[PDB]
Amino acid sequence: HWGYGKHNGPEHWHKDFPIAKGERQSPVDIDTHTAKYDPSLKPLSVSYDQATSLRILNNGHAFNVEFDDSQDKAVLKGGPLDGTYRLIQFHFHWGSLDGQGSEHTVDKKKYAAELHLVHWNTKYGDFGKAVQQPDGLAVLGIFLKVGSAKPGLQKVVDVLDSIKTKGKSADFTNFDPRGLLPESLDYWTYPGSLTTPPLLECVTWIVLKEPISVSSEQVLKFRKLNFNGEGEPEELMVDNWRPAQPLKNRQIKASFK
Ligand SMILES: NS(=O)(=O)c1ccc(NCc2ccc(B(O)O)cc2)cc1
Ligand SMILES: NS(=O)(=O)c1ccc(NCc2ccc(B(O)O)cc2)cc1
Ligand SMILES: [Zn+2]
Known part of the structure; x- marks a missing residue:
């Protein structure tokens, strides 16, 4: 029953998921002036040439584009990481308006949306085991601003009318x-958490500095999705973002000067 309404949204989650008030929760605000350049950080290695997307699913919170994670087909390595992380799914968080929607913020600025490419450390064998570990996941976060269309997003946008409601899926x-x-x-x-329940503290967050540009029309189509199931009252899937959480005993590291 958690969600993003007044009665079940982020300020309620702690009642069922007490780690919501934990020591390494996400997202956070990224203060660009107080992030520390870390010369030990390596370039990211994103190897997606053999990716195998399978399906797109409206899960009632967002939509997930799912991948075949039974082999190292689409992996993230390098950066802060000391293992190989397989891509399992990506999804977005977005707003009702262009002035909000991202989870992370930059000098307190919200973006219109945020893409999360979710990867799990292969040494743990499955995603479910990985989320139990302090280094189980690596999530690659990418901000979306509204401007020119993103060509490579359009295939996603165009399938959304076939997964309007919770529990629908389509080929992808x-x-x-x-x-x-x-x-x-x-x-x-920085070290953080899942941004939705169960809010597990298993994520090495990697947030790209450079946003992507998407068109107003592309993000408008995200906002036509529904949180509800078919045959239930229509609740638009908008504002499915958790706000920034306390930084606590963390300093964010930068790969760049
Ligand atoms: N956030 S949580 O602690 O898991 C939680 C929060 C609320 C509830 N139940 C009450 C509830 C559930 C859903 C909606 B709604 O607008 O769709 C409103 C009220 C159940 C669990
Ligand atoms: N928004 S986010 O931090 O990228 C993010 C949030 C939640 C999730 N996964 C949510 C979740 C957690 C555990 C299991 B399981 O199989 O035990 C399945 C799904 C994945 C990414
Ligand atoms: Zn996410």
Whole structure:
């Protein structure tokens, strides 16, 4: 019953998921002036050439584009990481208006949306085991601003009318997630959590500095999705973001000067 309404939204989550008030929760605000350049950080290595997308699912919170994670087909390495992390799914968080929607913020600025490419450390064997570990996941976060269309997003936008309501899924083969990346792979990183219940503290966050641009029309189509199931009262899927959480005993690291 958690969600994003007044009665079940982020300020309520702690009642069922007490780690919501934990020591390494996400998202956070990234203060660009107080992030520390870390010369030990390596370039990201994003290897998505053999990615195999399978399906797109409206899960009642967002939509997930799911991948075949039974082999190292689409992996993230390098950066702050000391293992190989398989891509399992990506999804977005977005607003009702262009002035909100991102989870992370930058000098307190919200973006219109945020893309999360979710990867799990292969040494743990499955995603469910990985989320139990302090280094189980690596989530690659990418901000979306509204301006020119993102060509590589359009295939996603166009299928959304077929997964309008909670529990719908559709085929989604042969999608190339490389078309969602910005040019630069400069990033910030810090230890954090899942941003939805169960809010587990298992994520090495890697947030790219350079946003991608999407069109107003693309993000308008995100906002036509529904949180509800078919045959239930229509609740638009908008404002499915958790606000910034206390930084606590963390300093964010920058890959760039
Ligand atoms: N956030 S949580 O602690 O898991 C939680 C919060 C609320 C509830 N139940 C009450 C509730 C559930 C859903 C909605 B709604 O607008 O769709 C409103 C009220 C159940 C669990
Ligand atoms: N928004 S986010 O921090 O990227 C993010 C939030 C939640 C999730 N996964 C949610 C979740 C957690 C555990 C299991 B399981 O199989 O035990 C399945 C799904 C994945 C990413
Ligand atoms: Zn997310």
